[PDB]
Amino acid sequence: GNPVICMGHHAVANGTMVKTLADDQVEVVTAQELVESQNLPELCPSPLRLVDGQTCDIINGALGSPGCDHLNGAEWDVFIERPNAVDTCYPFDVPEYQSLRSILANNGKFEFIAEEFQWNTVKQNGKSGACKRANVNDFFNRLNWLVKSDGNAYPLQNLTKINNGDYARLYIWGVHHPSTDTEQTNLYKNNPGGVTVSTKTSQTSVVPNIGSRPLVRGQSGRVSFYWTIVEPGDLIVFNTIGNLIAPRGHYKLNNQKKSTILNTAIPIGSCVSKCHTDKGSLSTTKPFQNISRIAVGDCPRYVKQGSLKLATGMRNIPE
Amino acid sequence: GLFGAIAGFIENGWQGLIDGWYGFRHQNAEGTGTAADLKSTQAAIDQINGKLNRLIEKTNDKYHQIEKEFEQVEGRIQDLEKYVEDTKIDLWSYNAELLVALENQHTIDVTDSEMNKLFERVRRQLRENAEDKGNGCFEIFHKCDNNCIESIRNGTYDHDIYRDEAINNRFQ
Ligand SMILES: CC(=O)N[C@H]1[C@H]([C@H](O)[C@H](O)CO)O[C@@](O)(C(=O)O)C[C@@H]1O
Numbered sequence A: 001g002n003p004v005i006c007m008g009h010h011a012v013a014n015g016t017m018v019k020t021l022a023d024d025q026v027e028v029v030t031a032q033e034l035v036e037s038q039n040l041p042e043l044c045p046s047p048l049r050l051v052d053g054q055t056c057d058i059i060n061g062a063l064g065s066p067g068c069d070h071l072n073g074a075e076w077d078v079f080i081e082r083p084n085a086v087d088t089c090y091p092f093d094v095p096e097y098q099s100l101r102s103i104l105a106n107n108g109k110f111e112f113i114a115e116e117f118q119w120n121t122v123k124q125n126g127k128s129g130a131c132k133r134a135n136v137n138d139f140f141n142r143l144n145w146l147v148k149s150d151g152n153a154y155p156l157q158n159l160t161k162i163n164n165g166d167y168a169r170l171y172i173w174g175v176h177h178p179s180t181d182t183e184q185t186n187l188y189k190n191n192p193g194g195v196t197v198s199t200k201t202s203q204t205s206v207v208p209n210i211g212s213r214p215l216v217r218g219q220s221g222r223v224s225f226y227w228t229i230v231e232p233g234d235l236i237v238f239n240t241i242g243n244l245i246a247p248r249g250h251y252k253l254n255n256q257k258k259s260t261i262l263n264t265a266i267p268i269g270s271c272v273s274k275c276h277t278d279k280g281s282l283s284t285t286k287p288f289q290n291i292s293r294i295a296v297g298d299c300p301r302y303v304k305q306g307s308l309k310l311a312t313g314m315r316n317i318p319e
Numbered sequence B: 001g002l003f004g005a006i007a008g009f010i011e012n013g014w015q016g017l018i019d020g021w022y023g024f025r026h027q028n029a030e031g032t033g034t035a036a037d038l039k040s041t042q043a044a045i046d047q048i049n050g051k052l053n054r055l056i057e058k059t060n061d062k063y064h065q066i067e068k069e070f071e072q073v074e075g076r077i078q079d080l081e082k083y084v085e086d087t088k089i090d091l092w093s094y095n096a097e098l099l100v101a102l103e104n105q106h107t108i109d110v111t112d113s114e115m116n117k118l119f120e121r122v123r124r125q126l127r128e129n130a131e132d133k134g135n136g137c138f139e140i141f142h143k144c145d146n147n148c149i150e151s152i153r154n155g156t157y158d159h160d161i162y163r164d165e166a167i168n169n170r171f172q
């Protein structure tokens, strides 16, 4: 009446603290961190297709600014846009800037299709010293500065392009704003100027704005950029009596747009990861991360907590 | 935990037990010994690793979203964009906080329960040949050599073999 058998459980010298509904410090034998709080100091070029803007933000790359030539034909899942990007062309603005930028990034590719526009009696291919391309006055290589005659004349323009292709087209066009009233007349005869771009079910009318702005790259004139989307079976009409910055063609729009843009200075490396933050790629299986709300791809969910420990063992009661 | 075994009538764990989560410690005429119980251990591990896999499971495959960082304020539209993201983050942070507390509460009850199931299993094996001492241990009222002990641990113990000896030791 003396043998004894005891039933028990393991323990370690020092366990890990976790939280329950009742207690915020329960020591358990093992635990697993669920919040990823470490990132790589680089972006992973695979398996997602990253395209480095380098000196060009995505707007300039679409416009065809000097230095943005490499971005031609580029296709991306994620467009990497650098904080230290610089304007290298004619001073401009975009009324709905973020919207155009969004459309370009989501679209996921820079596939330009050159087209013929037989304008008028006009001088085409106008250039500028604000947009130098290796020593020479130049311009946005996707845009065409129209500016009147040797014989002092730019009549009414009015050209039509009918989209009978199988894809939606993106036309980017602009309107030039002169500085005084000597201006326009010797860039653009008529006064006031004006552009009307329209489709079957749409329109857009812009009156230029003359006034003198600060000098940027040695100019006080500006160009405002716009865009028009032409669905298959629709068309587009360019109506102008002055100040039009004509397009040289159209960008092709993917039917389904799955791409995006990430603005960061982080360099592109050699690693493999499908989750990218503006602080760098994440390499993790954890369900949460506290590194950045700005996260693209296949990522853990962003949360505020720096740590959340999941118990993977029983309570630790050593000795 | 709910069953009062771990950190309960079992006063502490065994650092000496390194090849199992639960086990047996015995003392008889020819010595002492500690041995792991695989069934109880595996049952606990299966339920916890089961949690883990349901946890790491989740896509969250997001590409084009909204702007989330701003140089200068613009007003109404920016306010909304910020509010939406802030609202999202709070809700997901709450989800994360509650999930872990729920899982951990449950994991602790599960391991407490598995400890108790092992104890109860052995209790039922022993029938009238032993008495609960109150600390997770049974006093066995008959000679039980190493083979007898092992028969208890591997489920082949036949209480009728020793019942006459045990009954006599218990009540007289
Ligand atoms: C087509 C054309 O002739 N553009 C000329 C422009 C524009 O007239 C003004 O910039 C409008 O603001 O002015 C320049 O000094 C410039 O910018 O380099 C010379 C350039 O040749």
Ligand SMILES: *[C@@H]1O[C@H](CO)[C@@H](O)[C@H](O)[C@H]1NC(C)=O
Binding pocket: A158, A159, A160, A237, A238
């Ligand atoms: C030119 O404009 C006229 C009306 O002003 C219109 O009927 C015609 O379709 C236009 N043609 C082109 C090529 O734009």
Ligand SMILES: *[C@@H]1O[C@H](CO)[C@@H](O)[C@H](O)[C@H]1NC(C)=O
Binding pocket: A037, A290, A291, A305, A306, A307
């Ligand atoms: C994320 O959590 C870690 C600790 O796990 C902390 O050091 C870091 O500062 C946190 N990052 C934040 C709050 O942005």
